[PDB]
Assembly symmetry: D3
Homo-oligomer: 251 residues x 6
């Protein structure tokens, strides 16, 4: 039995029950090399898959691509192969002025501005992380020296209009999303990203443990397009954090 | 200065309290207050009975909510007008998972919004989640008490009967939306039903207020055994001792 | 057989098939004493229950608490015990300038700004009273000398944002409710309250007869304070009216 | 000076402020001839318009066509010319077993299974008649010796799937409507027709007085397609009732 | 042998027709039929006037719909019961784009579902799109008549007044949903407003029936000019010539 | 001047292209580019591999989208910022009708919006429709290739598993919304499932961009036979030859 998109078998995972799921296929090897005995397993489409060992236990690293749809495939196929815990690491845009580029955010719940979450549970259901994963992520983030924020994340199926960006081809935002960034800001929402609503709803409704930690690459109080110089330092810290969160989950 | 419209108390009456314990039943208010020091009756109007007491030397409010989001939302608003910023809900609940037993404790990590009042604060997409510090304090208090504690999702309904898929009713029928719903929530891992957490959590999380919910299981919708009087009595007492210890953990 | 919340049995109601349902537990005795042989039955939570006799027929008086959820419990449990007709008497805020403090309103339909109504019928279903109850309420209100208005009531799950109040802790109102008071005013809606949508929808979809009559205790458009003798008279007049409406319903 | 669709002027109405609005253009002359001085005014599309006199006062009779969209045009354009009261007469299918062919139904509220109502008020708003019109309709129906039922009407934008008819080209009903007739029956809904939700919602939200009376031409616990034998007698009774209800509304 | 309840015709009355032309106005039925051979009146009941005619030897129905999806849905259903499988809608419309002139033709490639009856056939997610062969035939016929033809999205409303964002009305009010809507559709590239296409196209695309819509522009909501009476007369005549030639292409 | 944030290309890199071919799989980009003249690798970042090539003398972009509306929406936006106005989507699909075989081609005439990202461009009422010229070009290219071609409605899902009503999954459960949904779409005449067309078509139709979708059938949900490797290889090669010939037809 080889899963349809990831191109791996259960035997390939050497008993892993925890996965680290970054978005970018290029981040997969980078995470895996922070652990022991990393091995490349497969690459198909946006899905690059490695295994490694953390404190003697097998751990998967698998990219998701951007968005809930491609995420949902990776999570499902990994769960078919025995993975039960999913630690998302990603980048994010802050919508509160006091959050700085380089800070870390651990999501306590997501605003479901996606479609895939609805393929698992009706809108009433909360897009919430597993409490142990969130706790582990907070501790790992703090222990790294990062400034960490816990709170609500707005999770959008688009980068552009659903995050109320106006520097676009049309410069238009549909009625639903006009004024939405200020509305979420006033409601205390910390940040925008694109996968947590799907991930957290899928997992919380399916017997899987999940959480999301993200490095802040932009503050929307300043600009819409992230600076490229900020990215590499923020990403290095984020992946150290998520591996330490994985360590806490396995202990 | 001003007296809020429903609760019948002033800011001065609260003696600087910034934390409230909010049970549903007005008769539980005095019982909670008497677990603390120097309890003082402030007011009773409608479903709202209000006491103050001292916990490690700090004033705490105890205020009942009544049943349901609407009455809850009034109490939370009016307490926040008077300086309360942290709200600890303690209440009874029905478990829907076979592994959860009468007498266990549940700390809600998020609520299924089967209510209306939450939508008066945030659109449905918004998560009905607790403040992380409150949830952490509640888990710690509940576990330290020696209880069996479950962290997870709660289904929060505007009705006791059809929205909890009860059929033992005058009409014996449930609107389409709720037919099969208990099994759906069970399959999704939802732990329990109650009637205030969706409103409370959504209101607070979208309004700069810290909230959480801990609940004592008084029925399991899947078990035929009837719980004995002693176990229910004990569960009620343990729930309020836990929420007072969670309040202690929140005080700064 | 004792119902779960109200703490009464069918025998306790002495054959009553009609209930008067105010919101405030303290008003229950005040209504019951306008009838013969009032007797306290139970008080639990927001539910205070009396029985009395009207023209020789037993009648229940039972408070509901604030909001549809607590109302829905009381109506269900009374219906399990044989009650088939429910007369609601309450306070309200008028939103039309021609309606004065002191006037009565008989609801002909409610705007469903609640949640519990949806636990009985989908939103398309009309929150309307039983025609005989509304007719009896109108006649009783007119016979008391009050100016009475028949019309639509906006029935909200909140006192604050859902009634478009801004003098609150946050001072915000969610998008759905911004501009809503003016919208209802322009649509001819008379007043706000917090239980009629649940009550009327529940009863109209469950074979129970229900209606609502309410005393105007504020006008959201008028500046002045009403004097005490008027407020006191309005409360007394409201409960005199509901009892006379009950008399009309019983033969 | 003529309205866009109806082809009539204010002068043509000769002071009428009340309209009788049947669906079928052929019922217009029949209604007008129950009154004094009937005069043909115009016929365009589904809109046939007459005037007549009732107790010395002008009344307009104007067909609507089938459905909310065509109804909404007629109501609007008549209101532009000074009409304020709208009496709907139509045919209907009963869904309760006890409601027989030839009975009359006066709608106390409509299930909004239409689209046009939403162009006047959001779904929460009740599709409710004016209380004076409903009272006049009940009185006219009862005084005529008819068997009369007061209650909720399911008002559908289709004759076929939205009324859960299966004897159709596809034999399919979309998920929303599968099982819907039994749900309405269990909820105590009396009947199906196609215009009341739009009419009542439009009028109740726009300062216009409206009500709906209908003659039962089929009982849906029996069959789907009305028998032709009984149509003429039921329609004659219905229009006699609606004209009397208009008499009761004249000031 | 049955006579359909509203249209008052039998299958035999249609002489084997599998295509219908469906204008809105009963008075246009005879006008369309007389562009074909051997037109014969079949029935008139309510808004439904029904003729039969022959086009290149093949029977065709012409049946009015009335205004709106509800009455349209009845005519389509009852014709389909009698063997009709292809439905060509010809109607009037209001353009909302400045580059579309009074007298141009529009062939709808999809409709904005601002109706209710479409929902009685398919949930809102389903696209209100024409059959591709019908749309192709309509485009070709329109071009061959010398008209300027636009292919694009049509906003299909259950009202003439608020749902087309008209304020020159008895109340002068437009419900929140429709406030600003005309500009929103304009900015989204929508060409025009009418009142039947959403129902027609959704019903047919979800029921195994082929449908399309072609319209002549009788007003432009952005232009202050008032068109000639001769231009309007010519537009009506051209629209029905076009729909008959589109039918010919479908029957070839 | 600017380099777009996700795609990592500039306007100058596109050498004047106003048309893009947008497959799903980054690995298909080079294969499509090599069917044209002078293919040039431009960038690869995340799921976005970008090439340029020349078709009859004109520059054409080829850019992968990844799986799903969200990643598609980014590519489309960023290409539009760089001057692209016409988007030709080629992808794989699962047929749900028995008459549609593996190796056949589908050209979508409208999409069932079972996605979220479409709603970020237009409300649900708006049709997820292709540009008529692109759909016409795709039908012609597909038919001219000798393939069997189906025009019709496509169900476009944000999931591969529950939203396509697959039960052989980790949980084996499908949420209520999607229980029975494949049969409902089948009965409504829907041809196929994929995961990007609703977003793409809605975004473009509401933004002044021309788009269409063509897909090769790689599986039929109603067939038990597994297609052989040669048939799948032929299908993938035919799909990309077809999309390139469709692009040729669109060039002006
Ligand atoms: N301002 C930002 C910054 C980052 N992200 C996240 O990173 C990817 C899109 O750039 C997506 O994976 C998304 O989660 C975002 O959405 N918004
Ligand atoms: N099975 C159960 C058990 C408890 N509750 C809680 O108790 C009150 C209503 O009885 C409400 O406060 C509600 O939260 C419930 O709803 N359902
Ligand atoms: N302006 C007003 C006036 C009165 N009410 C009624 O009083 C209770 C809340 O105060 C509720 O029970 C409600 O019936 C209200 O909601 N709004
Ligand atoms: N079973 C029935 C009977 C009657 N009607 C009403 O009559 C017309 C449709 O035949 C429509 O005008 C509609 O109001 C209906 O909808 N359903
Ligand atoms: N601006 C316009 C122009 C025309 N239409 C068409 O007009 C009929 C009702 O007037 C309807 O049948 C509709 O097709 C419209 O709705 N809006
Ligand atoms: N049965 C099928 C076949 C194909 N697809 C398409 O292939 C990619 C994911 O497999 C996605 O691009 C999707 O469009 C699908 O979703 N379902
Ligand atoms: N660029 C913008 C256009 C419209 N609204 C905005 O807030 N910004
Ligand atoms: Cl309690
Ligand atoms: Cl139990
Ligand atoms: Cl009261
Ligand atoms: Cl026409
Ligand atoms: Cl014009
Ligand atoms: Cl591909
Ligand atoms: K992706
Ligand atoms: K209450
Ligand atoms: K009509």
């Amino acid at each position: 039995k080889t899963v349809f998109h990831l191109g791996v078998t259960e035997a390939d995972l050497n008993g892993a029950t925890l996965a680290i799921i970054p978005g970018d296929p290029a981040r997969v090897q980078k995470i895996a090399e922070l652990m022991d005995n990393p091995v490349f397993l497969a690459s198909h489409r946006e899905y690059t898959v490695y295994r490694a060992e953390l404190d003697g236990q097998s751990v998967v690293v698998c990219s998701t691509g951007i968005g809930g749809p491609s995420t949902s495939i990776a999570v499902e196929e990994l769960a078919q192969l025995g993975v039960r815990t999913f630690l998302r690491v990603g980048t994010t845009g802050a919508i509160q002025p006091h959050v700085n580029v380089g800070d870390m955010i651990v999501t306590t719940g997501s605003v479901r501005l996606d479609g895939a979450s609805l393929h698992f549970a009706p809108m009433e259901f909360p897009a919430v992380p597993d409490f142990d994963v969130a706790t582990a992520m907070k501790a790992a983030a703090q222990e790294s020296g990062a400034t960490v924020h816990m709170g609500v994340t707005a999770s959008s199926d688009t980068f552009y209009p659903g995050q109320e960006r106006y520097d676009t081809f049309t410069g238009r935002v549909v009625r639903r999303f006009q004024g939405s960034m200020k509305e979420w800001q006033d409601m205390g929402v910390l940040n925008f990203e694109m996968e947590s609503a799907t991930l957290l709803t899928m997992c919380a409704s399916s017997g899987l443990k999940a959480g999301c930690v993200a490095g802040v690459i932009i503050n929307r109080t300043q600009k819409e397009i992230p600076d490229h110089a900020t990215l590499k330092e923020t990403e290095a810290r984020s992946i150290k954090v998520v591996v330490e969160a994985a360590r806490k989950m396995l202990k």
